[PDB]
Amino acid sequence: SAEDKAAVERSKMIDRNLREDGEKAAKEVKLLLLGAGESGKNTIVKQMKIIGIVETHFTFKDLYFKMFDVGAQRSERKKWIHCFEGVTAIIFCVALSDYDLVLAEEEMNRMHASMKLFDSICNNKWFTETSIILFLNKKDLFEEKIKRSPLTICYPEYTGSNTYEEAAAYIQCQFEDLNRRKDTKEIYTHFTCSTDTKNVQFVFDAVTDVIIKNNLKECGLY
Amino acid sequence: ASIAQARKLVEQLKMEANIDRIKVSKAAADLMAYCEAHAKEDPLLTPVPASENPFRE
Amino acid sequence: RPLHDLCKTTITSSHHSSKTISSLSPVLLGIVWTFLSCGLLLILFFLAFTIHCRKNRIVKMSSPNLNIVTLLGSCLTYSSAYLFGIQDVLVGSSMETLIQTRLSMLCIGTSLVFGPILGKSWRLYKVFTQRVPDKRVIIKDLQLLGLVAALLMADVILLMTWVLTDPIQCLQILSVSMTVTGKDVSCTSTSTHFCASRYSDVWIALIWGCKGLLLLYGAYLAGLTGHVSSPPVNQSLTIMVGVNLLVLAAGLLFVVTRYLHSWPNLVFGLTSGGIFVCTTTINCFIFIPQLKQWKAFEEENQTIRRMAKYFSTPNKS
Amino acid sequence: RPLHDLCKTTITSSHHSSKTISSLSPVLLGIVWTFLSCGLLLILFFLAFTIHCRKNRIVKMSSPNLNIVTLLGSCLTYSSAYLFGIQDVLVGSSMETLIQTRLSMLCIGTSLVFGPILGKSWRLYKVFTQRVPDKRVIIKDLQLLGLVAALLMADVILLMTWVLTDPIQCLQILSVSMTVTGKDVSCTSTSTHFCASRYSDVWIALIWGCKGLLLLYGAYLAGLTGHVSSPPVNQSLTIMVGVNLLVLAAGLLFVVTRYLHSWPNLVFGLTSGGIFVCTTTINCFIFIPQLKQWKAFE
Amino acid sequence: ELDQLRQEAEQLKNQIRDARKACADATLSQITNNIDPVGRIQMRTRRTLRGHLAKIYAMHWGTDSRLLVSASQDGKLIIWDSYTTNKVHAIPLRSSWVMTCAYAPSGNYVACGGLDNICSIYNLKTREGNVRVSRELAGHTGYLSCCRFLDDNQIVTSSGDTTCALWDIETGQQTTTFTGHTGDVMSLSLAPDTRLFVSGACDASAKLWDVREGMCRQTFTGHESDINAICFFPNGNAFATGSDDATCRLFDLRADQELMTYSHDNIICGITSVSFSKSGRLLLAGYDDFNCNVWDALKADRAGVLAGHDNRVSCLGVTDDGMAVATGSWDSFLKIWN
């Protein structure tokens, strides 16, 4: 029974490595990156990198962030979406320039596709308590387009003028209205551009808020 | 055009299937025969005593 | 020495002894009772607020159950301050009992007031400083109640050994004593009806030393959560004010009780005032910001401001 | 009235009474002196280190001048612990002034030890964090020395009031008392030779309450800087352990001194041991983290 | 253009249907009425393998009925000695999004795969002593849902791109490819004779393939939702399925139809895993209700319940000798039952 003792010692060694690389893994921030294609996901992952399934790593103020891009999965989303149930936050990218743009694969604004995808993800049974970081890209391009193409082409019920800072706010609340779990999750909207303005910092602030609120909810204080 | 393979698939299935369609009574009979032949060798069907149970010795 | 002879000579005259009678100005008793009853009404108002608002987010971010426990503790302190004016006749057996009871209620009340505050501060520190995306901070009210119960248990074990090993013997001592210097000699005689126990300073030092360790840890916690959140939830200023007031009141009241047994009105007034001031100040510091922020929190929860810390690692000169 | 005559007769029957004496086993005195001397030598060493290395980077991040002030406070405390062993009079009345000087140097040394640590922590809390675009370098060692001098002025005023207003007189008292409980009469006889003063508790309470307020603010500062940096600069752990040990030692020695005056060996041993433990623990916690990086980087 | 083929298709499936009852004179229910029941099946948790941290998505018993591989989404493969609960190995995965795991019949290899679209073979018996990735089988365009070894050289995998592939591990090439499903194949099952295997897809259809040449033999329908699990009957003539509609169904190859349905009205959660006993008399199944139900394969009544997990039971396994049954779950614990 000496080799048995050696086997038990090896097993205990293995539990020890498991504990170390598990407690190390608990300190990383998992971010699921969603959004329709050509909407800025590549650009977004570009600034977060410079600081199948594609996984990206980046550090910011110590916090270690893992970002999983699942845009290459053409399979049924419902079958693997129960994975990522434990991600700390979801990053959603929407191109504001898509408002007057229909979609390949017509009469469908690439904009209403973003809406339907956001509606499905936000109100999913697996993400009832997971906050969403909503990124609205292409600020300058959209604000240029808004000066000759009215937002009414996308929203027949819109009444405001054709100025970006009002239209962008209108789109912001329209995407937040799709949230039907206002009492358990929160949406951190942020406007970005081609240039990295504050994207990584905004993600860091949102994630820090999410961690603090998760701690508060666990103690029953929030 | 590409769907052209589904007719050949289904006709192969037809011949492959109706070459033998033994009665479901026969399938049921051989199923019960197989189940009752290997009974008493299935440790789950009848609980194995702890003397030769490797998970409690 | 003729002391032994005069011993038995005074024993014949020692058959009787002076009794006791109430000599507390009624006005004083009246004003004090009014102040204490008003403080108890304030306590009832604060508990009513708490309960009614237990679902308000901010009230929910302020640990209502621990606020309740602190309120019970404050009620205990108020009732003990009510008891410090019960210097009336009663009977010897009860006077011992009365003093022991009021001191043990005051000690228990202090524990029940300060335990929950320290628990809230420790939980807030853990929540706002440990930021692990997969290991959450899970502290419930049951655990903090358990810590408060441990504090309470320790306090009652100390009080139990105090009463069961060395009670407050109220005794009549008639004594005459002559004191001599290197070149001078004089004589004096005195009578003293004091309700003190043998080795009283042992118990005072022990009880107030455990309380002092608790207060030191409380000050440490208040420093730890310096700018963790806003005053409604931060509560570090409450701890600092409370510990300073507790130290000042404890020292002053101890000194006055020991050296002014001949001034019953002054001792009673100072004791009641100190207890009332400390308890009311702590309770107000606990509850006033909740009342202030309660009205601004129904409209819509966007004005969340508590989230705000202080962590950086710049180099040092 | 009946005791009046008895007391007058007793006073006449004094016959000059008598006096006793107390001594401390030479053995104990030996071990206590060897411990206090090696602690003092450690202090001197630490001071030599500090000065000699006043240029090294670690020594500049640890505020060497305030560490010097802390070391002098430590020597004052150690010399007071030496004085707790002396029992014989020099001029007869010297016992009173010996005890008063003993306690005065104890208080002064405690203030001098705990001042600079709090000053360092406060300066660190200021510059570290509390940083707006403005720079707060305004805090140099002159203001921290000023705060330490303010503490020293405060405790010197307290000691001065104690020593001019109600000093320590050593009196011999003989007394006879009658104890009547509710249902019995008891007799006792007492002879007592203690060095103390009337209203002693007042002075104890006042001095230790000022100390306690200082310790509460020190614990607050230690909490305020609990995460700023590492031990050589942090000193939060030093403050916490120091205040806890100070409270425990103060309580224990006070009670032992009051209720064990008939055990001179035990009182002397416990007092010296407590003073030595507190001073040595605080000094080591301050300085050995410095020494580690000093020998590491050099 | 398409109308003629479309009507020929419809008449084709009417002939399918009326051929089905042309051999369905009776059903399994009456022929098994005379059989005495198995009674109430009692199982006790013998061991509880701990060490996994995230949800456990797959397991597989070794052919020695003693070793056991388990895959969890914490990025860890763990091999357990079920008798002594010692962890023999702990393999770090390149991608932590593993959703399947397999054990070579020889015991020398372990496979895993998932959202990375890659089936990675690991060599357990390396001279160096550690375990290294022997191969990385690429070519699938969807997530890999199940993989099973035919030998040390051939492995068959199912993917979310509606295709199953037969691989040659040395050359790393797709020897054969299974087309015909319109749904992500969610599971596979090798027949004991290792000449045919079945695949369960999200289109509520199960097909039987011939690994030697690569054309679908028969198509089995009867499920209303996606098929999540599948396993051959021990004799290699029937197979059971697990769907999201809380129903398990049994199909025979020769009769080529439904045989018997294992459902209960008070069960609304979907099945995650099925497996027969050694004799094929018990059909065990994992459910989302945190419990495992043992179904009498001949009577369609629950005979036992394995309530030992506080989360979804994601995988089952029956040892080759039939001595034990292991239940992995999302609560990161395995449990061997007996």
Ligand SMILES: CCCCCCCC/C=C/CCCCCCCC(=O)O[C@H](COC(=O)CCCCCCCCCCCCCCCCC)COP(=O)(O)OC[C@@H](O)CO
């Ligand atoms: C550390 C922080 C807390 C510090 C403590 C808090 C401060 C609160 C104050 C207490 C001040 C009043 C204390 C006593 C004041 C009167 C004592 C005095 O000086 O006069 C007494 C007798 O006068 C009287 O006849 C009493 C008539 C009332 C006069 C005071 C006015 C009311 C007072 C209204 C103020 C409210 C107090 C009611 C408390 C509620 C909570 C705040 C003599 O004394 P004696 O005992 O008879 O002995 C004499 C000896 O020479 C030989 O007999």
Ligand SMILES: CCCCCCCC/C=C/CCCCCCCC(=O)O[C@H](COC(=O)CCCCCCCCCCCCCCCCC)COP(=O)(O)OC[C@@H](O)CO
């Ligand atoms: C960082 C380095 C730490 C170094 C020290 C560590 C521990 C600190 C303390 C040691 C205290 C032991 C000293 C013994 C106490 C004095 C005993 C004595 O000498 O006699 C006294 C005589 O009363 C007095 O008048 C002297 C008291 C006034 C001076 C205070 C001492 C200065 C300062 C004191 C300590 C300063 C801090 C106070 C801490 C605060 C932390 C909260 C009692 O007489 P009695 O025997 O009770 O009889 C009386 C009755 O029976 C008939 O009236």
Ligand SMILES: CCCCCCCC/C=C/CCCCCCCC(=O)O[C@H](COC(=O)CCCCCCCCCCCCCCCCC)COP(=O)(O)OC[C@@H](O)CO
């Ligand atoms: C947070 C800090 C809290 C405080 C913690 C510090 C405490 C540390 C130590 C205290 C030492 C134990 C007490 C010393 C001896 C007293 C024990 C005792 O009981 O023995 C005495 C007298 O016996 C002797 O004379 C034996 C001589 C030495 C015996 C042990 C000492 C050796 C070594 C000692 C250890 C080293 C000493 C100094 C080291 C650090 C110093 C910096 C009885 O008393 P008495 O008055 O003569 O009898 C009168 C009565 O019967 C009727 O009149």
Ligand SMILES: CCCCCCCC/C=C\CCCCCCCC(=O)O[C@H](COC(=O)CCCCCCCCCCCCCCCCC)COP(=O)(O)OC[C@@H](O)CO
């Ligand atoms: C909740 C928010 C804050 C609440 C504000 C609390 C205010 C605290 C204030 C003042 C204390 C009340 C004053 C009464 C104190 C007892 C005095 C008394 O009445 O009896 C004493 C004698 O007693 C005893 O013999 C035993 C003493 C028991 C002490 C434990 C009491 C429980 C705990 C007590 C402390 C409770 C607070 C602990 C905080 C701590 C902050 C540091 C008279 O002694 P003597 O006449 O001089 O002796 C003559 C000599 O010849 C022979 O002994």
Ligand SMILES: CC(C)CCC[C@@H](C)[C@H]1CC[C@H]2[C@@H]3CC=C4C[C@@H](O)CC[C@]4(C)[C@H]3CC[C@]12C
């Ligand atoms: C934390 C724990 C260890 C503190 C314990 C403190 C104990 C030891 C203190 C507090 C009260 C003190 C007791 C008070 C009363 C008496 C009765 C007397 O006739 C003998 C001494 C004796 C028995 C004391 C012994 C020491 C004592 C019991």
Ligand SMILES: CC(C)CCC[C@@H](C)[C@H]1CC[C@H]2[C@@H]3CC=C4C[C@@H](O)CC[C@]4(C)[C@H]3CC[C@]12C
């Ligand atoms: C760190 C600070 C808060 C000090 C700790 C608080 C307590 C333990 C301190 C503060 C004031 C101190 C008291 C001051 C007055 C006396 C009267 C004296 O005859 C016995 C000691 C005693 C009772 C002291 C015991 C310790 C004490 C109660």
Ligand SMILES: CC(C)CCC[C@@H](C)[C@H]1CC[C@H]2[C@@H]3CC=C4C[C@@H](O)CC[C@]4(C)[C@H]3CC[C@]12C
């Ligand atoms: C007799 C006189 C000298 C007693 C004075 C007691 C004073 C110094 C005590 C009592 C209340 C205490 C204050 C309570 C609240 C605060 C706010 C905090 O953010 C800094 C500490 C600070 C400022 C304390 C400083 C010390 C303090 C002011």
Ligand SMILES: CC(C)CCC[C@@H](C)[C@H]1CC[C@H]2[C@@H]3CC=C4C[C@@H](O)CC[C@]4(C)[C@H]3CC[C@]12C
């Ligand atoms: C911060 C403030 C409140 C502290 C006040 C401390 C005071 C109350 C303490 C310190 C000095 C003490 C006095 C010292 C001397 C005497 C003379 C004596 O015949 C009666 C007691 C009396 C009058 C004491 C009363 C209490 C006393 C005055």
Ligand SMILES: CC(C)CCC[C@@H](C)[C@H]1CC[C@H]2[C@@H]3CC=C4C[C@@H](O)CC[C@]4(C)[C@H]3CC[C@]12C
């Ligand atoms: C904040 C304020 C209320 C603190 C007031 C503290 C006062 C009440 C304390 C401090 C000094 C103390 C006085 C000190 C001296 C004396 C003279 C003596 O023959 C009667 C008691 C008496 C008169 C004390 C009464 C109480 C006293 C005046």
Ligand SMILES: CC(C)CCC[C@@H](C)[C@H]1CC[C@H]2[C@@H]3CC=C4C[C@@H](O)CC[C@]4(C)[C@H]3CC[C@]12C
């Ligand atoms: C002496 C008689 C009149 C009793 C006086 C009680 C006073 C001094 C006490 C009791 C209630 C206390 C107040 C409670 C409410 C407030 C409002 C806010 O700013 C906090 C401090 C402050 C201002 C406190 C100051 C001190 C306070 C006013």
Ligand SMILES: CC(C)CCC[C@@H](C)[C@H]1CC[C@H]2[C@@H]3CC=C4C[C@@H](O)CC[C@]4(C)[C@H]3CC[C@]12C
């Ligand atoms: C910060 C300031 C307010 C602290 C003041 C503390 C004062 C009030 C304390 C410290 C010393 C104490 C004095 C010590 C000596 C005496 C002489 C005695 O016969 C009457 C009490 C009296 C007069 C005390 C009164 C109160 C007292 C003066």
Ligand SMILES: CC(C)CCC[C@@H](C)[C@H]1CC[C@H]2[C@@H]3CC=C4C[C@@H](O)CC[C@]4(C)[C@H]3CC[C@]12C
């Ligand atoms: C007789 C028994 C009760 C004495 C117990 C003394 C204990 C309470 C004292 C001695 C050592 C002290 C600890 C020393 C170190 C630390 C770590 C610091 O980050 C928090 C304070 C803390 C945790 C102190 C808490 C109080 C403490 C634990």
Ligand SMILES: CC(C)CCC[C@@H](C)[C@H]1CC[C@H]2[C@@H]3CC=C4C[C@@H](O)CC[C@]4(C)[C@H]3CC[C@]12C
């Ligand atoms: C917790 C801190 C503050 C207090 C430390 C405990 C000290 C004070 C306790 C522990 C043991 C106690 C002693 C136990 C036994 C005796 C013998 C008795 O005839 C006189 C009292 C005396 C001498 C006690 C005095 C107080 C005492 C020394």
Ligand SMILES: CC(C)CCC[C@@H](C)[C@H]1CC[C@H]2[C@@H]3CC=C4C[C@@H](O)CC[C@]4(C)[C@H]3CC[C@]12C
């Ligand atoms: C750290 C260690 C050394 C601290 C030890 C403290 C010890 C020595 C203290 C604490 C309690 C004290 C004891 C309390 C009670 C008694 C009973 C009495 O009839 C003789 C003194 C005696 C025996 C004391 C001796 C000294 C004592 C035992």
Ligand SMILES: CC(C)CCC[C@@H](C)[C@H]1CC[C@H]2[C@@H]3CC=C4C[C@@H](O)CC[C@]4(C)[C@H]3CC[C@]12C
């Ligand atoms: C008579 C004998 C038992 C007395 C022993 C006193 C010892 C225990 C005291 C004196 C010096 C103290 C040490 C001083 C320095 C350090 C380094 C610090 O990083 C940890 C605490 C530590 C290690 C202290 C532990 C306790 C200590 C070693």
